Amino acid sequence: LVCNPWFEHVSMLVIMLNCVTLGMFRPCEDVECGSERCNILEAFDAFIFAFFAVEMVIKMVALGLDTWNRLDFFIVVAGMMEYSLDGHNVSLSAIRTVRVLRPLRAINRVPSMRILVTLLLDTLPMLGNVLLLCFFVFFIFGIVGVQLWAGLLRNRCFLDSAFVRNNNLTFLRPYYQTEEGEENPFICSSRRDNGMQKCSHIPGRRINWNQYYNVCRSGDSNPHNGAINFDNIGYAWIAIFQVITLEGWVDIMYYVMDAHSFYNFIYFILLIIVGSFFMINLCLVVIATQFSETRIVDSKYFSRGIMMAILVNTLSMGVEYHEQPEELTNALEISNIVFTSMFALEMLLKLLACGPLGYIRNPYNIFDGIIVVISVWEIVGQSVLRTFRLLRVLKLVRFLPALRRQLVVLVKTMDNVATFCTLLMLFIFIFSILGMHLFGCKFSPDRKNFDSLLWAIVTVFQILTQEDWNVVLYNGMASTSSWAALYFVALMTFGNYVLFNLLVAILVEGFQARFRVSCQKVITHKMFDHVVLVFIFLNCVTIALERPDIDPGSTERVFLSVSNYIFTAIFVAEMMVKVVALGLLSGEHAYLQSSWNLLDGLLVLVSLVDIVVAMAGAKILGVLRVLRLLRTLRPLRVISRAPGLKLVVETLISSLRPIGNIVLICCAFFIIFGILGVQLFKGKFYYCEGPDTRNISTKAQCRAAHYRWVRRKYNFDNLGQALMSLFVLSSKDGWVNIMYDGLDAVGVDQQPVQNHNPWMLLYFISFLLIVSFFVLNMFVGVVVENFHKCRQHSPTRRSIHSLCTSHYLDLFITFIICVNVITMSMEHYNQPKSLDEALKYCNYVFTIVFVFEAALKLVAFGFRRFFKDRWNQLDLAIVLLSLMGITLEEIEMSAALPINPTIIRIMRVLRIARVLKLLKMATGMRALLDTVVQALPQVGNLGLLFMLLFFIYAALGVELFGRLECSEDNPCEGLSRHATFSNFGMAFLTLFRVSTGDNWNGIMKDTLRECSREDKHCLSYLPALSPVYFVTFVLVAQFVLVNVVVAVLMKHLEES
Ligand SMILES: CCCCCCCCCCCCCCC(=O)OC[C@H](COP(=O)(O)OCCN)OC(=O)CCCCCCCCCCCCCC
Ligand SMILES: CC(C)CCC[C@@H](C)[C@H]1CC[C@H]2[C@@H]3CC=C4C[C@@H](OC(=O)CCC(=O)O)CC[C@]4(C)[C@H]3CC[C@]12C
Ligand SMILES: CC(C)CCC[C@@H](C)[C@H]1CC[C@H]2[C@@H]3CC=C4C[C@@H](OC(=O)CCC(=O)O)CC[C@]4(C)[C@H]3CC[C@]12C
Ligand SMILES: CC(C)CCC[C@@H](C)[C@H]1CC[C@H]2[C@@H]3CC=C4C[C@@H](OC(=O)CCC(=O)O)CC[C@]4(C)[C@H]3CC[C@]12C
Ligand SMILES: CC(C)CCC[C@@H](C)[C@H]1CC[C@H]2[C@@H]3CC=C4C[C@@H](OC(=O)CCC(=O)O)CC[C@]4(C)[C@H]3CC[C@]12C
Ligand SMILES: CC1(C)C[C@@H](CN2CCC(F)(CNC(=O)c3cc(Cl)cc(Cl)c3)CC2)CCO1
Ligand SMILES: [Ca+2]
């Protein structure tokens, strides 16, 4: 019975059968239970429970009263409750949700999965230190947010009560709401605040009703059907968690910038650094560390000739585009006819030399033979085989030993990744059917729905890639309850911050296992570099003051122009003195013998050319524009003057060498999938734009209805457009909307139809999985190489003294603060007056208790001894600080009111410093933080290079996208009043959003759209420079952040 191993196979067979039974559930066709298909299924479910209820009885009898056995018991008891409770209509369907745990039974049956899970479960206990840091981040930022912005997102511009009453009119809506309704609320700034958006910024009517919306008072709903708000700690954590995932964090920021103050970007800039970057990556570091702790034919010319033939044929395949001329199509087919014949000629020649048996011996020779038959088949069969022509690129593996070796390493990586992938599909499947039960037919139908297994699996994969996962959250919260946020918190936590970081650990562990003399003296002078470095810094200020809105006749413009001449002359002399002392190139130690000196040569050379063009009253405007762009690279001279920056830059360029092959393989997949996308999707990315297009089906009907026939910004018309779209897909920002366009594509001059071809999910989901795999071997490649580099390198006082030294006092304080932590989370918007008094009294008790602690501490140790320890100093600061906060509160109560209310609010917010006491107790957390501190010298310079990169691009963006405008005639999708390149200050903030990758594809869209005919000073080739601007910044920015993570990882490993 139980001894025989085949019994387990029988149990496994039933398990797989139970999984398919769950996957056939239809959310809102089986709830009625009136169909015959449901009737057979429920019987089929009942039969399966009988087996498992039977089996558990046999096993219990055989073995009597193993964690997995306990889980199996829990499923039986829970389902028995569901089964036995039948006949009671009170929450019968709700009890039906526990059956989603049945597939977990498969973990124990598969030995490989059981081992991996067991290893995973033994790594969790050491993640508590990271969890405590998560509590500090959420709790500190969760109360500061509530204290500042509690109830400020309800604000709306209302009509005056006297106005409506006296004039006896009630046709107007009570408060301004744009015609989209509550989906895009207009949040105003209260009179006592200084938010950016005021009720006087309301656009006029388009005699005027809008001008009478001139009262900003609290409304009756928060943004997104109440989902986004800070009215209490519960709703503040939903907002903070969404910011940590870097999805829609700007939208939350803009809401409080419009209502409270522009300087709220400080709150979100710190959160994205402390929480989104360091906290969410310290999880990766801890897991990875802990896992490690647990005759003519053979001629060279012939091979080169064949290699060239394949390469040229591949290039030809990528020259197709929409509206292709007929002659070009004919030429390509003739080219295909020739190339396949050439391979056929090679196919025959090799057969003769080695014979039929000899040719079969070579494995690559077998693959080539498979290609010739299909190539000839296509001609003789004269379109599905056309898509198979892309396989010819695989022939190049024969002649690339470096890539051939690399591909072998990646292929062998699948043996270790196979077990994990099986664990990810089970994880997704359980959450897919769980979602169906909760959000079944409740999303009234949105494309991101849980109405069926196919579209429930896709919506769970989309959430885990963090693309519009908040849009689903709002629908989930509104439909069922605000507590539905727990579904997304668990799905995003166990999936991205546990399972994904386990995959990286699997890979890492697998791999791991006379005048000239004067010049010579002046340049060699110690302070020469620092003197020059000061001039460069002053030159950065001049660059950062440039902006489009500078009036040419103003004094600022002349000042900027004059300084440019001064700095140009200064740096010419500095270059001139160096060359005289060292010589241009003739000498061995000549000036141009080092790249850094060469870099300064070009920067000086372009400056001289700029002067000449400026000297020239001629048609040279185009040249002046290019020069203005290259004059933003001047800050690059800082690297050679700072030894710390020079070393790190040379280190990053070194890290690119080990992963060079993977990059080349990654760039080869972009072209392969880019060419494939063009063939499938060229010319099909057009749609009819208008208020109502349910009738439109073709281009002509769109013109007849006086609507506009437009094209998607990200399409696959040609390999140029296909590569730009694939990069956006790979970045996982806006990747869903490109998928929707592919599914809806119908044909040339045809209106797309929703979910026309669901089979295209394979093209897009496959790309996002393959690319994520490569970009995971780049991170591992950097880590492994770094590890290689690192290895090679009085009686009344005595009782008081006993108490203070005793741990009793410390643990008592930890209890009081934990109570204070609870009390501080009691506050919410519009709390009852009784609560205000109760919380005020609770503050009194804490104040005196802390005061006694300081008094006892002073007596036990003495004034000089007590002040020595830094912890005691921290106590004194808060106790002194706490007294100041309470003192002002009582004066505010008192008749005198000289205290500005901002002071009282700031004091209340700053009283959260009491939580810092607990940091003393958490020895484990402190040691984790010490790891980052030990890594600061390496991470400090990488932060300097991050800011230098920001400065160059922030100043460059202003030059490029400075004059782009947003208007109802030319609407913008990513830019707004908050995200603009108008000046250096705003371009700096916009680039921070781009680095986080929040709707950065929307910003690029706004630069690709054609300018208005009437508008002037519009750069004709801007759509060509924009993709280069955003691609290079995204890749350069992400490479630096990866190295910061590797730097901390190494310090952790070498400390344990
Ligand atoms: C340490 C934190 C780390 C994880 C944080 C991740 C995000 C957690 C979000 C989960 C909680 C979701 C509930 C949010 C909430 O407050 O709303 C519930 C309720 C409103 O929903 P009704 O459908 O009842 O609407 C009633 C309309 N009149 O809000 C309330 O009115 C009070 C709910 C309790 C307040 C929150 C206290 C507990 C803390 C949050 C719970 C999650 C803990 C996360 C570990
Ligand atoms: C460690 C902490 C998180 C646990 C203990 C804190 C709770 C006891 C606090 C946190 C937030 C408080 C809530 C914040 C807001 C509200 C809504 C308020 O008004 C409503 O019920 C209307 C809600 C709506 O309209 O959305 C009633 C009190 C209540 C439930 C508060 C009751 C006390 C709560 C649950
Ligand atoms: C990268 C390797 C593997 C293959 C080489 C790719 C090229 C064949 C691609 C890259 C850029 C592509 C071009 C990008 C843009 C255009 C413009 C497009 O429209 C026009 O010619 C504009 C006409 C006008 O403006 O009046 C026609 C296709 C073409 C030439 C594309 C043809 C195919 C090109 C040359
Ligand atoms: C180390 C480097 C980066 C130098 C330090 C940065 C400064 C040069 C930046 C940061 C803040 C910037 C300022 C932020 C805000 C404004 C207002 C803004 O004014 C307008 O565009 C006009 C407004 C109006 O007319 O109402 C743009 C210029 C200015 C002074 C910016 C000029 C450049 C400043 C001083
Ligand atoms: C291989 C992976 C890592 C991506 C690398 C970056 C690409 C996404 C970039 C590099 C060059 C870019 C192309 C450079 C120039 C053009 C021409 C541009 O068309 C025009 O010039 C029309 C505007 C005009 O009239 O000036 C359309 C975008 C495109 C194909 C760009 C698309 C995005 C490209 C392929
Ligand atoms: C390795 C890197 C370059 C990426 C960084 C990972 N980092 C945090 C988790 C994150 F990947 C979210 N996870 C997904 O998006 C995801 C995507 C796929 Cl295809 C499947 C699934 Cl299950 C999840 C976002 C970025 C970690 C250190 O640096
Ligand atoms: Ca996004």
Swiss-Prot record:
Residues annotated as glycosylated: 89, 168, 695
Q: What does the PTM comment of the record read?
A: In response to raising of intracellular calcium, the T-type channels are activated by CaM-kinase II.
Query: According to the record, where are the IV repeats?
Result: 794-1053
Q: Which domain of life is it from?
A: Eukaryota
Q: Which residues lie on this side of the membrane: Extracellular?
A: 25-46, 82-90, 151-263, 322-334, 441-483, 546-563, 615-625, 682-758, 828-841, 890-903, 963-1025
Q: Where are the I repeats?
A: 1-291
Q: Where is this site: Calcium ion selectivity and permeability?
A: 247, 467, 733, 998
Q: In which tissues is it expressed?
A: Expressed in the adrenal glomerulosa (at protein level). In nonneuronal tissues, the highest expression levels are found in the kidney, liver, and heart. In the brain, most abundant in the amygdala, caudate nucleus, and putamen. In the heart, expressed in blood vessels.
Q: Where are the transmembrane segments?
A: 6-24, 47-65, 67-81, 91-109, 130-150, 264-288, 301-321, 335-356, 363-381, 385-408, 420-440, 484-508, 523-545, 564-584, 595-614, 626-647, 658-681, 759-784, 807-827, 842-863, 871-889, 904-927, 942-962, 1026-1053
Q: What is the effect of changing residue 355 to S?
A: In ECA6; uncertain significance
The II repeats are at 295-511
**Segments in the Cytoplasmic topological domain:** 110-129, 357-362, 409-419, 585-594, 648-657, 864-870, 928-941
Q: How does it assemble?
A: Interacts (via N-terminal cytoplasmic domain) with STAC.
Per the entry, what this protein does is: Voltage-sensitive calcium channel that gives rise to T-type calcium currents. T-type calcium channels belong to the 'low-voltage activated (LVA)' group. A particularity of this type of channel is an opening at quite negative potentials, and a voltage-dependent inactivation. T-type channels serve pacemaking functions in both central neurons and cardiac nodal cells and support calcium signaling in secretory cells and vascular smooth muscle. They may also be involved in the modulation of firing patterns of neurons.
Instruction: State the disease linkage annotated in the record.
Output: Epilepsy, idiopathic generalized 6: A disorder characterized by recurring generalized seizures in the absence of detectable brain lesions and/or metabolic abnormalities. Generalized seizures arise diffusely and simultaneously from both hemispheres of the brain. Epilepsy, childhood absence 6: A subtype of idiopathic generalized epilepsy characterized by an onset at age 6-7 years, frequent absence seizures (several per day) and bilateral, synchronous, symmetric 3-Hz spike waves on EEG. Tonic-clonic seizures often develop in adolescence. Absence seizures may either remit or persist into adulthood.
Family, as annotated:
Belongs to the calcium channel alpha-1 subunit (TC 1.A.1.11) family. CACNA1H subfamily.
> Protein name, please?
Voltage-dependent T-type calcium channel subunit alpha-1H
Lineage start: Eukaryota, Metazoa, Chordata, Craniata, Vertebrata
